[PDB]
Write a protein that binds this ligand. Structure first.
Ligand code: EMC
Ligand code: EMC
Lengths: 361, 361
């Protein structure tokens, strides 16, 4: 069997034709950005599962299986909470210029791009409250995506929508992971991890998601299998210190708004309803990596994409879809772990957030 | 009984504290605009029922009854299809400046405005394809709303989001209607009518919604109870002529995207779930005014608001809510009829759309 191994770069672009672009702003009061997932020409079948709603979603109704539009070209993940939805307008503008969207005239230039977006809360984490992504930053992200070749490695860590992301007080960020199925199809995820809950078991210091990893995939990051009690005691103290200092700097504790945004993708052909099921099932992967999740205040959103390049079968259909559904959860769990490990700490007038590796590696 | 009569101006602002603002652009290639419904200080309980999705919705997930945010301050209705969602960013900016939104810091200036929006398709109807509402036009609409006193009459016709609206080939627009309940509560609707279907019975020329009118409310518009067969024959011919000319001018037939946007409001206190039921039930009012509705390509969206100023009871609760639910459908039916009657025809390089009264009055 050829399955159970990561794709070439262990990331979202291992789904052929998918491109990812980041644009960010750091320094001078800023710590935010935008990540765009760009489908190949012709678009991708897309669905969404939102748990905890807005503030900060756009065009989610368009992704209902009953609706007219059958594919989309781009999903926008952004900082800036509801304000950052402004980034999506810049992406829609770019798509129009490219002639990419729902056709609304005999002239191929006349199109309406359906651009779903979800935003995470990172306000003030650079120091300046009104420092949020705008249309220009959104445009920059999709232009960055378009400039990449197929199968290009995805940058992880404090980039794009992950720039200002924080998970349980630790620095969060962008992470990605993939897996090849025995059928040869690839399933992959990209996550911007900004959760209220913890990626770390408070009893041990072990990352919750680590036991879902594929053999050896995290070895390059350099964290021991066994974490010493003294190391974990020290890490907990440092995190508590950072949290108290952050609360002082923000003139108030920890954000009431938090979340994880994600895109799961595959080249296996899915109907919209099957993609909607995949988006829903991928939330399980988040639960296995972070605890607690899906709180009242947590705006967790997963988009699912199919490029429709491989038939599900190269109850047999159910079995094939179950493989994709199970992989969808696992790649999201793994992407969250990668985000946490890829992050480097920050220290700004808007927050002090050390990374996992700064505490445990 | 004091019920079964319209409120003071027969419109949405008969719900005390509600304000409505329009901003539009006409001429020089333009025929579009934005309508904002602004809740009183402290916000309103809000819900939504979307049928036919996007392209062109924003922050609808935030209105789910499970979610954190308990009230909102503004709903944005806009032209420009998905591009026009850009208008909502301007409204969010204004709300932030006013300190109005979900509180996210001990400082009252730190807020995240939840601004739901829905867009209708009017592209190119002024002549210029890229002539769509932007953030500035959205800001202008909410500023216009804020400048009005309570209980101010709502302008109808080709204004705000109704500027470029077309219903079954006839000029559409903004319409509004209200009714007082025996309890003393008011229920009202505002509609931007842009449907694929017809407001007019093709067999007779009679407006479908007219028989839902309250006694005498349409008398000021001057259309006979009995429409002559010859008048109706002439009207049908003129509409067909306008449709064929429009198709020539647009280098292609009639838009694939159409809809009706609406806001229903009441001062009776509703939970979010009760408001969601009201939004769903109000769609029935649309069905009674327009046929067909809710087609695959029709993006019909109804927002429902409660200002929470009157108790439902001043199974009794069910009976009181049923009165509100029934009124919600009726005021929407009536608002659609008002939109059709208030409209005046247009003739631009992007379309020829006569009004109902130009054909039948
Ligand atoms: C801040 C909820 Hg994605
Ligand atoms: C054009 C669908 Hg509100």
């Amino acid at each position: 069997g050829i399955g159970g191994v990561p794709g070439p770069h262990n990331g979202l672009t291992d789904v052929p034709g998918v491109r990812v672009g980041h644009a960010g702003r750091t320094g001078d009061g800023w710590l935010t950005g935008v990540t765009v997932v760009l489908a190949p020409p012709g678009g991708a079948v897309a669905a969404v599962d939102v748990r905890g709603g807005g503030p900060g979603t756009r065009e989610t109704d368009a992704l209902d299986p009953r609706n007219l539009v059958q594919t989309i070209d781009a999903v926008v993940l952004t900082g800036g909470s509801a304000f950052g939805l402004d980034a999506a307008g810049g992406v829609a503008a770019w798509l129009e210029e490219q002639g990419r969207g729902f056709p609304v005239g005999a002239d191929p230039s006349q199109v309406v791009p359906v651009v779903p977006a979800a935003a995470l809360f990172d306000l003030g984490r650079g120091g300046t409250w009104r420092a949020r992504p705008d249309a220009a930053l959104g445009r920059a992200a999709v232009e960055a995506a378009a400039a990449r070749p197929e199968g290009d490695p995805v940058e992880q860590g404090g980039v794009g929508a992950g720039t200002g992301a924080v998970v349980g007080g630790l620095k969060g960020g962008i992470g990605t992971a993939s897996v090849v199925l025995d059928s040869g199809a690839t399933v992959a995820a990209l996550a911007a991890v900004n959760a209220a809950g913890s990626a770390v078991d408070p009893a041990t210091g072990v990352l919750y998601g680590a036991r879902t990893g594929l053999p050896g995939e995290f070895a390059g990051y350099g964290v021991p299998d066994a974490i010493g009690a003294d190391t974990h005691a020290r890490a907990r103290a440092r995190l508590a210190e950072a949290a108290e200092e952050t609360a002082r700097r923000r003139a108030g504790g920890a954000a009431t708004l938090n979340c994880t945004l994600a895109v799961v993708a595959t080249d296996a052909t899915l109907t919209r309803a099957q993609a909607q099921k995949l988006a829903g099932t991928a939330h399980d992967g988040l639960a296995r990596a972070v605890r607690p999740v899906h709180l009242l205040s947590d705006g967790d959103t997963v988009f699912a994409l199919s490029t429709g390049r491989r038939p599900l079968l190269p109850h047999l259909e159910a079995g094939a879809l179950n493989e994709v559904l199970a992989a969808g959860a696992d790649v999201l769990t793994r992407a969250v772990v990668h985000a946490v490990l890829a992050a480097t700490g920050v220290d700004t007038p808007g927050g002090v957030h050390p990374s996992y590796r700064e505490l445990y590696a």
